[PDB]
């Protein structure tokens, strides 16, 4: 239901959909 991105649950809004650990993680 959440997260649009398979790689990391927690990817803000804001680091979605590009679906990168960095943005949706850290630097």
Same mark, same amino acid.
């Given at each position: 239901g /959440? &997260? /649009?991105c #398979? !790689?990391? #649950?927690? +990817? &803000?809004? /804001?680091?979605?959909?590009? +679906? &990168?650990?960095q943005? +949706? !993680?850290? #630097?």
């Amino acid at each position: 239901g /959440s &997260s /649009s991105c #398979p !790689q990391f #649950p927690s +990817c &803000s809004p /804001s680091c979605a959909p590009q +679906c &990168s650990q960095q943005c +949706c !993680q850290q #630097p």
